[PDB]
A and B are shown apart, each in its own frame.
Chain A
Amino acid sequence: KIHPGVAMTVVRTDEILSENILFSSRASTSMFIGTPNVSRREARVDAVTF
């Protein structure tokens, strides 16, 4: 416990879980919405996925 001839400055980061509030004004964006559509992807030994 003898001082070495130099000091040190220690840096840490810390994480904080927090709740939030989001305010969005009226009619701020325009969403264009297209029809949903389906296509098959696989066929395995037992089942078919879409």
Chain B
Amino acid sequence: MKVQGSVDRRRLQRRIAGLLPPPARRLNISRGSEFTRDVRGLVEEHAQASSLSAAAVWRAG
């Protein structure tokens, strides 16, 4: 408190949090439940990555 300081840890964290790579895309082939929970995501990500209408394509860009 006694001094404000010259930088904001909040801003530094939030500005880095936008430069970390996207995680990997796993696919469990040992449990049916996880297998489906990942294939659902696979189809959602294809849609989001190839549908012109949305801006999410341009974001994944």
Interface residues in chain A, defined as those with a beta carbon under 8 Å from any beta carbon in chain B: 35-40, 48, 50
Contact = CB atoms under 8 A, between A and B. Distances in A.
A36 B61 CA distance: 17
Would you call the interface of chain A mostly helix, strand, loop, or mixed?
loop
Interface of B: 50-53, 57-58, 61
A37 B51 contact: yes
A50 to B, nearest CB: 7
Q: 6 tightest CB-CB pairs across the interface, nearest first? A: A38-B52, A36-B52, A38-B57, A37-B50, A37-B52, A48-B61
Contacts of B50: 37-39
Nearest to B60: A40
A39 B58 CA distance: 10
